[PDB]
């Protein structure tokens, strides 16, 4: 090692090769008649998919003694189940199914929107823009697509308040109305909060992962070659934390409406 | 903000839930509580 | 003025979050510090917390949502 | 200019988040630390956080409702 | 410029909400940390707390005329 | 300007608002934090808590002076 | 003021951002300060300290979007 | 520009407030904390919260007869 | 109006390093405090410590990016 | 695009080598530790067992 | 343009303040508290607060200098 | 020639030279009255003087009390009736033949001249009282004494040259917000409405009067010391 | 404008040395209090003190190269 | 405009004393209040303290030089 | 000046309703200060 | 600008105001200084 820190294989083509920008907030593949499917909807079906045989690979075969996939899968489960327990007890089981699923699924679309080739193949001037159409990117983050997150934030937001309805009573008066006291100013802060919490999830996934996608995409264009290292794991950490805080925050917005 | 795309992306969602329930987290959950079950 | 609308979105969404993100900061930060001082009182002072953490997010998007009705 | 009301709308809304928010930081700040200190007295000091949080929130009251008056 | 005036007046209400909403965040702040050492003087602190709140809030009333006059 | 008037009276008022808000919440928080720690000084320690904020005061006197010789 | 859309997506990114990181610094140093006080809780206090650090994140990422929308429309 | 003075003297007086005036409020609040610490120290710790508060004020002052300058 | 690059430029780079600034310096003063208060436990601290320098000097090259694409 | 990929590819077998030899490691260790002490138990109770 | 130069006399008297301001104050609050803890390291400690007075006045003096510099 | 401002410092000295005459006419133990007052106040500033330096806490005692009487008049006076209400002429009482109407009573603190001469006073006390035991030593820099200390030395130079500039000013940025403070309350509202600032007016006169001599025996400490 | 080279110079220089002007004092002011309360842990949390340091100069000299690239 | 390059001398001197003259404050009230809890690390706790303020110091003059460069 | 004269009014009634209530501890400190004298 | 012949005015009236009362309480003092 010593101090063989050189960087001259980083002096290659620092912002001539690779496209200036090319970035986007919203792509559709269609392909089909009627309904026009997305490349981030693509991505989601290989992520779900992929997660599918996943499950199935750790399932095949389950033994009592963990190992590998199986070992892997089940420390990860259990150190899940023992984190929303530490928040709340008495519910974990009922909404353990969404919160995993949110989490298991938001993880796998962050890292695979880092992998290589999702802004550079697609069906300066690369390939298609070389011919008369429109070089559309392929292999889309589902997180970077509204309609993907958005759908999340609401299942979370029925799914909430569907069980803040089914304990405690329909009452709902420290948010609904109070009689005297400051409560009454209280339940109308507290009704607008929670209808901002859904839009605030949404959009707090939808851009901490377009925003990394997009630096990754800029960070390739100028100085292409072995800085983008620290920022990719950053960006695999950002996702990591992004996917299990959304899961956290859903589990602990269940509970303080079951308070 | 495509109203089909958004009910598509729900509707996708939702399947992986149901089929993650149905295949992965109850066969985990009772292997892990047979542990405890054991233990 | 050629694009003022442009400034008052940045504004907007600018000026909307560097108070609320000190606020958030110091509410979780004196949680963790009375959660460390007294372990025990955990179950409902974390209600506290997130009521106060709802309510400056609401403040937040408040300026956000406001930015959005110019960006349309 | 020509949008110097959403400018207007923009700089009123941040600059209410921007006080307000580190206000209601610093109140669950302080009513965190004396529950971690004292839970006995949750009963009285959850309400005085209460009286002390809507009064600060009034402030951010006051910016939306003229933000919504320019929009209007 | 002729939203000048629209400027002005939600600059006013903005900034004038700033330094308020701080100053009542940290008195109650302060006033619940000292409930939680000392509930036996409640009510002496509360009316303290009370005379903070109120010229912070006398500030803030301050500013919203001068925005009122200005818009109107 | 027509209404250059209107914002330097603003931007005054609200500045003058800004700091002197955050120093008495101060003054106010360390006041009430020392009589909890000791009620026997309160006349003592409440004594130099009115002559701060009334220094406190000043600036924001002086701001809404200068604004309304403007404003006028 | 062709170019009023640089400023604009410049302030987007530059304002909202100064918050968030304030509150990801104080975030840390109570979490630290708590755990050096109390070593054993780190593992279930680090996760609260996490949501705070990214909900300030969140909103320089709000702060960050609306300036890449700025900037391309 | 036209009455570009106005708004340069509220420019001046306004940010001549906003740091003197949390200084004096940080002073007063520490001075008011060691008094409660200390009752007897009470004669050297006033001389110079005094010189201090003159310091800090100092700066505003400044603010204050610039903002003179220019108006007049 | 040309120009208004080199400002907007300046802008980003000093609105998004001002934050990350006070950020890493509560992070480093907080670290070493509580490495002070118990050296034992380091690692389990320094670990945590570089976790929030590196999310906040990430958010300082996420201004730094943003304001090169405008000065390239 | 014949001038992103490259450079995509190329950082992503680095940060592959990286994680592998920074983190492969003590993932390793923790799953191994995991399944030591289930081995352990499970062998503790088909002794009681039997 | 005609009044530029009384907006830049403006700006450096103001934001030549708001920091030495905070400084001197927080200088003075760390001086007063380590007195309440000590009074016999006075002398060794009132040198170094006047010496941080002296380099944060004298920052503030700087600017107020300039200004004036500007205004002739 | 003389301005509005000049009568009323002419008439707060012949107010303290009264009260002074008041007070000595009938000097005896135990005081009761204006003797009384005076004692006590007199008492608790040299009390506060000693606090600060019991060296030369009598040094300029008397210099030290004038200004403070001279101060606290100033404010006194300003609050008053009468002042800035009657027009000397060189709607309002004075709208026939215009002139501005002139107050009769303008605060002496009011001016830059009045309030230039306390601090030029208390500039040539400190230096000499500074340089009186001191020499070189007063103004010493520390050329290099602790690496480089000249800087230090310098900037702190500046620091003492410009507190009595700073304090003047801000006697007489006081003064005259107080006065713009009330006349902007009365234009504000007829009556009532002033009674918040009015009594604060009184009380920041008084605090600013105390802290006044308060700073002068404290830079004189740190000149001596 | 023949002249926004100058102000975006300024604003490279100052803003962005403004969170580098106050992390680095909250750097040192925690070192040094960790050094009060243990001396024989010097050079462990001097090391970090200067690993701060060098985090936030990194974003300052950022601050001034953007600045002389405006400038040139 | 013609006075601009007087606006950016005005924003380089005042914007560069803000975060220098509040990390000058933190850094001497932390070390005034060590040297109060403990005399003895007198020493290290000045030569830190002035390492610290030298730092802050050189990042005045970045701005400082900058303006006399206009300015001269 | 109508103006002038209701300032004033206001001016003095709120001087001596601030200055009784002051007096009145004053005059119990000056009595006591007598009273300590001998 | 302030006019010189106004401030040299009301220093000398301060000068003698302060000398009068130098001379006033010179007998005063010694008197507190006595009871005490």
């Given amino acids: 090692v010593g101090a063989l820190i050189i960087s001259i294989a980083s002096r290659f083509f620092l912002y001539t090769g690779p496209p200036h920008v090319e970035v986007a907030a919203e792509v559709i593949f269609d392909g089909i008649p009627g309904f026009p499917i997305t490349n981030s909807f693509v991505v989601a079906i290989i992520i779900d998919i992929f997660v599918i045989a996943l499950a199935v690979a750790a399932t095949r075969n389950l033994q009592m003694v963990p190992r590998g996939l199986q070992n892997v899968m089940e420390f990860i489960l259990e150190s899940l189940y023992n984190l929303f327990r530490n928040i709340n007890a008495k519910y974990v089981a009922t909404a353990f199914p969404l919160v995993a699923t949110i989490f298991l699924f938001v993880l796998f679309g962050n890292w695979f929107g880092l992998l290589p080739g999702v802004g550079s193949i697609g069906v300066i001037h690369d390939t298609c823009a070389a011919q008369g159409k429109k070089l559309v990117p392929l292999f889309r983050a589902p997180a970077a697509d509204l309609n993907f997150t958005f759908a999340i934030a609401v299942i979370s937001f029925v799914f909430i308040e569907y069980w803040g309805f089914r304990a405690l009573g329909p009452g709902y008066l420290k948010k609904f109305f109070n009689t005297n006291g400051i409560m009454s100013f209280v339940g109308i802060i507290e009704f607008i909060s929670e209808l901002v919490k859904p839009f605030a999830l949404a959009f707090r996934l939808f851009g901490n992962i377009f925003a990394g996608e997009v630096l990754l995409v800029v960070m390739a264009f100028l100085v292409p070659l072995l800085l983008p290292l620290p920022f990719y794991g950053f960006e695999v950490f950002v996702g990591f934390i992004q996917a299990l805080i959304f899961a956290l925050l859903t589990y602990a917005f269940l509970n303080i409406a079951v308070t | ?39 | 003025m050629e694009g003022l609308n442009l400034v008052a979105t940045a504004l907007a969404v600018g000026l909307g979050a560097i108070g609320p993100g000190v606020g958030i900061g110091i509410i979780v930060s004196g949680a963790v510090q009375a959660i460390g001082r007294n372990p025990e009182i955990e179950n409902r002072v974390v209600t506290y917390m997130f009521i106060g953490i709802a309510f400056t997010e609401a403040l937040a998007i408040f300026g956000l949502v406001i930015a959005f009705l110019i960006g349309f």
């Fill in chain 2, 1 to 39: 903000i495509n109203p089909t795309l958004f009910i598509a992306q729900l509707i996708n969602f939702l399947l992986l839930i149901f089929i993650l329930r149905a295949l992965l987290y109850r066969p985990v959950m009772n292997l892990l509580n047979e542990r405890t079950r054991r233990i």
